[PDB]
């Protein structure tokens, strides 16, 4: 994990240009642009590679890598110094509000539909990243996160009778 | 070939090629009043000289990563690559560290570099790496080597960030080459001898007077005037001078006779300029020409040697003392000498005794310029006086 | 210098470079083994292996300069051998103190003392053709004033353990407990 963070930060071009650089802001605008590109077929191949879905998968994979690359659950991080430094680097690279906003998108719950877009698995990477780099230890933070990113998705999941195309 | 020892004053310069033009930008720190650093123009020193006084740091300790982490979990050495150094600001006495806040919205991931008082933590330490494949870790560093400074805490490079007006060095992940120009080798600095970059003043042998300007009771245009004065001015802030040499390396060496150097007023921050239609006055930095503001000290009155000394890349030789060293001011352009006048007529002789200093050819064979260095306390007090008066005057107009 | 060829390479300087590399490696492995007074089986093997490697390199250097060949003398003089030998002095001054407080490291101590003997005979072979004002003497006094602290510690070590062969079995300690094989309550020894 340490050498991977070192290599990624030494060559910063590995991160997506929408997240990193003097141009794009971060994951919020990246995800919104990916959603509009996925819905609008004019920015794809006229079984083709959905460019919006591919961008979404790339960012979800990057976030999952960073989350699983986080030092620990503060077992060794409580008494170590380099773990604290790696956690601080991860926190400085990705802002928390961006992560909360991306979690709160409330995808639709669809006669089936096509799942080659914003897959629900993309949110699991963000959840794991929050749990590992930041965690849930503040009452108001936990409550606001549940309000903005979980209740709508929980309702969408609970609103099933027979048409269950997505497990 | 000269190695970088410890407890020596060095300078951190770099080259910046923006808008198809190269420039040599230095690392400077105001110290008092602000924390973050900034850049200084070592190049273009023909009309605007660089404030080298605040671009000087001193290396305290050179420990390895293991030794540093052991001391954190708890001598004239030689600088090696891969080690960790502690850059103490030479003037302010604080220490260079990597700040935590951010100022450039263009770099959403970089940190600032500034000064801090305490030496605790990993922020105030910087690990050294080479900028070439010919030198690996553990080799001894020499003068002129291009170095790379990496933060120990943030693991960021001391990067030269570019901006329209925010030309400020920060802690970014893109490396930048830095050259280390020595000022004082930390070797045996001859006590009682004149050293470059010193803050001192002048006295006479049997007159007990000093070269100074009017106090703050008069306007700035009247303070620009230059004269001699005695009494309590002997211990005063407006009576000190600084020998700002022209070289950017080894400027804090033994100043020898004949070499050029600007005379800076510590209280006003201006230099002794001279335009031939008038006498010498004080003028600011934004138009200080080398030929106009360059002076030297001669040991006699003749013109036997002018262009004899060109460049010495070293500490030099202990020649000019403070007490028993009768110098004579000589301009690099006109070659005139100091003369005391009687500007105060007999009608007001017993009032404020001031004899204006006109620089002329003949002079009087009774000057006897004696050097006298001021303690670090006095120098720090005078410079912080200038800094705070500048900030407070700007604030007064900005509020008015 | 293989005179007769056209692109001669110096093997002596390369040997010095490898010695410097193994010296920095030993120094780092010691900085790792600082504070913890426990040397495991791997901590013993990885030290004995490097001790043997350094001993062989030192013997090779001794054979390079064993004959009074002023060429190799000056080649070692104008090289980076002094950094390696001062690093070895620095690591010895601390290993000698650390390995003596506890048992189960007498083999490591013996191998290290042997390596130190080979190193000192190596740097002594540099003076077999010495002159009253040679450059090698200047370099040697230079490395001495450059590592005065560690060499003072090691001389104190040797003096302290050499002032014991005569301090015990000469005047009184030999007749304190005349029973047989050496038996001491360790309290009469303290006052002794």
Q: Can you spell out the DSSP letters for chain A?
A: -HHHHHHHHHSGGGS-TTTSSSS---HHHHHHHHHHHHH-GGGS------HHHHHHHHHHHHHHHHHHHS--SSSSTTT-SHHHHHHHHHHHHS-HHHHHHHHTT----------SSS-THHHHHHHHHIIIII-S--HHHHHHHHHHHTHHHHHHHH--SS-----
Dihedral sign for Cα atoms in the order A159, A162, A163, A166: positive
CA distances from B142 to B2, B65, B313 (A): 5, 21, 14
With beta carbons less than 8 A apart as the criterion, state whether A122 and A104 touch.
no
B165 secondary structure, DSSP code:
S
Using the beta-carbon criterion (under 8 Å), do B173 and A12 form an inter-chain contact?
Answer: yes
Q: Rounded to whole angstroms, how far apart are CA atoms B151 and B98?
A: 7
With beta carbons less than 8 A apart as the criterion, state whether B75 and B63 touch.
no
Q: What does the H/E/C string look like for A52-68?
A: HHHHHHHHHHHHHHHHH
| A68 close contact with B: CB closer than 8 A | no
Q: Which of B106, B108, B173 sits opposite A9 (nearest CB)?
A: B173
| Chain B contact set for C35 (CB, 8 A) | 70
| Chain B contact set for A82 (CB, 8 A) | none
Q: Is B59 helix (H, G, I), strand (E, B) or coil?
A: strand
Phi, psi of C179 (to 5 degrees): -110, -45
| A3 close contact with B: CB closer than 8 A | no
| Chain B contact set for C24 (CB, 8 A) | 138
Q: Which helix (H) or strand (E) holds B245?
A: strand B241-245
The residues near A145 (Cβ < 8 Å, ≥ 6 apart) are A100, A103, A130, A136
Using the beta-carbon criterion (under 8 Å), do A81 and B72 form an inter-chain contact?
Answer: yes
Q: Rounded to whole angstroms, how far apart are CA atoms B125 and B71?
A: 12
Angle subtended by helix axes C70-77 and C11-32, to nearest 10: 40
Q: Is C55 helix (H, G, I), strand (E, B) or coil?
A: helix
Q: Rounded to whole angstroms, how far apart are CA atoms C93 and B323?
A: 49
Nearest to A77 by CA among A69, A87, A92, A64: A87
What is the Cβ-side half-sphere exposure of residue B265, based on CA atoms within 13 angstroms? 28
Q: Rounded to whole angstroms, how far apart are CA atoms B75 and B60?
A: 9
| B267 close contact with A: CB closer than 8 A | no
10 Å CB burial of residue A12 (0-12, 13-18, 19+) is middle
User: Resolution reached, in Å?
Assistant: 3.8
Q: Rounded to whole angstroms, how far apart are CA atoms B117 and A4?
A: 34
- The β-bridge relationship of strands B38-41 and B157-160 is unpaired
Using the beta-carbon criterion (under 8 Å), do A85 and B153 form an inter-chain contact?
Answer: yes
| Chain B contact set for A10 (CB, 8 A) | 173
What is the Cβ-side half-sphere exposure of residue C147, based on CA atoms within 13 angstroms? 21
| A128 close contact with B: CB closer than 8 A | no
What is the Cβ-side half-sphere exposure of residue C138, based on CA atoms within 13 angstroms? 6
Neighbours of C179 (CB within 10 A): 7
> B115 - beta bridge partners?
B96
Question: Smallest CA–CA separation between C98 and chain B, in Å?
Answer: 17
CA distances from B358 to B137, B294, C157, C170 (A): 58, 17, 72, 89
The residues near B187 (Cβ < 8 Å, ≥ 6 apart) are B5, B315
| C28 close contact with B: CB closer than 8 A | yes
B195 secondary structure, DSSP code:
B
Using the beta-carbon criterion (under 8 Å), do B66 and C32 form an inter-chain contact?
Answer: yes
Question: Smallest CA–CA separation between A7 and chain B, in Å?
Answer: 11
The residues near B304 (Cβ < 8 Å, ≥ 6 apart) are none
Question: Smallest CA–CA separation between C16 and chain B, in Å?
Answer: 14
Q: How was this structure determined?
A: cryo-EM
C35 secondary structure, DSSP code:
S
| B2 close contact with A: CB closer than 8 A | no
Angle subtended by helix axes C81-98 and C11-32, to nearest 10: 30
Q: Rounded to whole angstroms, how far apart are CA atoms A130 and A125?
A: 9
Helix ranges, chain C (H)? 11-32, 41-64, 70-77, 81-98, 106-124, 135-146, 148-162, 165-168, 188-191
Question: Smallest CA–CA separation between C174 and chain B, in Å?
Answer: 45
Phi, psi of B203 (to 5 degrees): -135, 170
Task: Output the CA angle C16-C22-C26, nearest 5 degrees.
Answer: 140
Using the beta-carbon criterion (under 8 Å), do B106 and A22 form an inter-chain contact?
Answer: yes
With beta carbons less than 8 A apart as the criterion, state whether B196 and B326 touch.
no
Using the beta-carbon criterion (under 8 Å), do C28 and B66 form an inter-chain contact?
Answer: yes
How many B×C Cβ pairs under 8 Å?
12
Q: Rounded to whole angstroms, how far apart are CA atoms C63 and B153?
A: 47
Question: Smallest CA–CA separation between B90 and chain C, in Å?
Answer: 27
Using the beta-carbon criterion (under 8 Å), do C31 and B138 form an inter-chain contact?
Answer: no
Phi-psi region of B208 (alpha: psi -120 to 50; beta: other; left: phi over 0): left
| Chain C contact set for B64 (CB, 8 A) | 31
| Chain C contact set for B66 (CB, 8 A) | 28, 31-32, 34
| Chain B contact set for A93 (CB, 8 A) | 109
Residue in chain B lying closest to A90 (CA): B109
10 Å CB burial of residue C2 (0-12, 13-18, 19+) is exposed
With beta carbons less than 8 A apart as the criterion, state whether B382 and B266 touch.
yes
Using the beta-carbon criterion (under 8 Å), do B155 and A92 form an inter-chain contact?
Answer: no
Nearest to B199 by CA among B148, B121, B255, B149: B255
Disruptive mutation site among B3, B66, B74 for chain C (greatest number of C CBs within 10 Å): B66
| C35 close contact with B: CB closer than 8 A | yes
Q: Rounded to whole angstroms, how far apart are CA atoms B5 and B185?
A: 8
Buried b (16+ CB within 10 A) or exposed e, C99-126: beeeeebeebeebbeebbebbeebbebb
With beta carbons less than 8 A apart as the criterion, state whether B262 and B288 touch.
yes
CA distances from A33 to A55, B132, B218, B338, B367 (A): 9, 43, 66, 75, 80
Using the beta-carbon criterion (under 8 Å), do A89 and B155 form an inter-chain contact?
Answer: yes
Neighbours of A74 (CB within 10 A): 14
- Cα Rg of chain C (Å, integer): 21
Angle subtended by helix axes A96-103 and A139-149, to nearest 10: 40
């Amino acid at each position: 994990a340490n050498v991977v963070v070192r290599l990624l930060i030494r060559r910063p071009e590995c991160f997506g240009p929408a997240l990193r650089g003097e141009g794009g802001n971060g994951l919020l605008a990246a995800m919104e642009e990916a959603i509009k590109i996925a819905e609008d077929p004019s920015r794809d191949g006229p079984d083709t590679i959905h460019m919006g879905n591919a961008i979404m998968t790339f960012y979800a994979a990057l976030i999952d890598l960073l989350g699983r690359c986080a030092p620990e659950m503060h077992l060794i991080h409580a008494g170590k110094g380099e773990a604290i430094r790696i956690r601080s680097i991860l926190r400085s690279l990705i802002p928390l509000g961006d992560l909360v906003g991306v979690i709160s998108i409330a995808f639709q719950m669809p006669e089936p539909d096509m799942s080659a877009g914003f897959c629900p698995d993309h949110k699991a990477a963000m959840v794991l990243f929050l749990d590992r780099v930041y965690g849930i230890e503040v009452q108001d933070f936990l409550l606001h996160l549940l309000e903005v990113g979980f209740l709508p998705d929980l309702r969408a999941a609970a609103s099933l009778d027979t048409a269950a195309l997505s497990x | 070939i000269q190695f970088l020892r410890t407890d020596d004053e060095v300078v951190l310069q770099c080259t910046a090629t923006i808008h198809k033009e190269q420039q040599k930008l230095c690392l400077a720190a105001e110290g008092f009043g602000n924390r973050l650093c900034f850049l200084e123009s070592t190049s273009n020193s023909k009309n605007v000289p660089p404030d080298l006084s605040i671009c000087t740091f001193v290396l305290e300790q050179s420990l390895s990563v293991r030794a540093l982490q052991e001391m954190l979990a708890n001598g004239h050495r030689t600088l090696l690559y891969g080690h960790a150094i502690l850059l103490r600001h030479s003037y302010s006495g604080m220490y260079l560290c990597c700040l935590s806040t951010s100022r450039s919205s263009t770099d959403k991931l970089a940190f600032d570099v500034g000064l801090q008082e305490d030496t605790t933590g990993e922020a105030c330490w910087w690990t050294i790496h080479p900028a070439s494949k010919q030198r690996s870790e553990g080799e001894k560093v020499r003068v002129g080597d291009d170095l790379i400074l990496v933060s120990v805490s943030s693991e960021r490079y001391l990067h030269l960030s570019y901006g329209n007006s925010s030309w400020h060095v920060d802690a970014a992940f893109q490396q930048t080459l830095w050259s280390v120009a020595p000022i004082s080798s930390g070797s045996e600095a001859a006590q009682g001898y004149l050293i470059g970059g010193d803050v001192l003043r002048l006295l006479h042998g049997h007159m007990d007077e000093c070269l100074t300007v009017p106090s703050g009771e008069h306007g700035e245009e009247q303070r620009r005037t230059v004269h001699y004065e005695g009494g309590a001015v002997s211990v005063h802030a407006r009576s000190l001078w600084r020998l700002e040499t022209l070289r950017v390396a080894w400027s804090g060496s033994h100043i020898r006779w004949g070499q050029p150097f600007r005379l800076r007023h510590v209280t006003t921050g201006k230099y002794l300029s001279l335009m031939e239609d008038k006498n010498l006055l004080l003028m600011d930095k934004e138009k200080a020409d080398v030929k106009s503001t360059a002076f030297a000290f001669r040991s006699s009155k003749e013109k036997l040697d002018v262009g004899v000394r060109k460049e010495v890349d070293g500490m030099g030789t202990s020649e000019i003392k403070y007490g028993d060293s009768i110098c004579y001011i000589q301009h690099v352009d006109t070659g005139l000498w100091l003369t005391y006048q009687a500007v105060d007529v007999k009608s007001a002789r017993m009032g404020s005794i001031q004899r204006k200093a006109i620089m002329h050819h003949e002079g009087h064979m009774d000057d006897g310029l004696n050097l006298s260095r001021s303690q670090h306390e006095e120098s720090r007090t005078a410079r912080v006086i200038r800094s705070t008066v500048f900030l407070f005057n700007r604030f007064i107009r900005g509020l008015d | 210098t293989q005179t007769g060829n056209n692109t001669t390479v110096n093997i002596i300087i390369s040997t010095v470079d490898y010695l410097l590399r193994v010296q920095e490696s030993i120094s780092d492995f010691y900085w790792y083994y600082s504070g913890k007074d426990i040397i495991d089986e791997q901590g013993q093997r990885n030290f004995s292996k490097a001790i043997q490697v350094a001993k062989q390199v030192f013997n090779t250097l001794t054979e390079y300069i064993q004959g009074p060949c002023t060429g190799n003398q000056q080649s070692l003089a104008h090289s980076r051998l002094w950094d390696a030998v001062v690093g070895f002095l620095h690591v010895f001054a601390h290993m000698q103190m650390k390995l003596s407080q506890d048992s189960s490291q007498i083999e490591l101590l013996k191998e290290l003392m042997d390596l130190q003997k080979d190193m000192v005979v190596m740097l002594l072979s540099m003076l077999e053709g010495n002159v009253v004002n040679g450059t090698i003497g200047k370099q040697m006094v230079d490395m001495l004033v450059e590592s005065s602290n560690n060499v003072e510690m090691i001389l104190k070590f040797f003096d302290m353990f050499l002032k014991l062969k005569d301090l015990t079995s000469s005047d009184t300690f030999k007749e304190y407990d005349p029973d047989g094989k050496g038996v001491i309550s360790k309290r009469d020894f303290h006052k002794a």
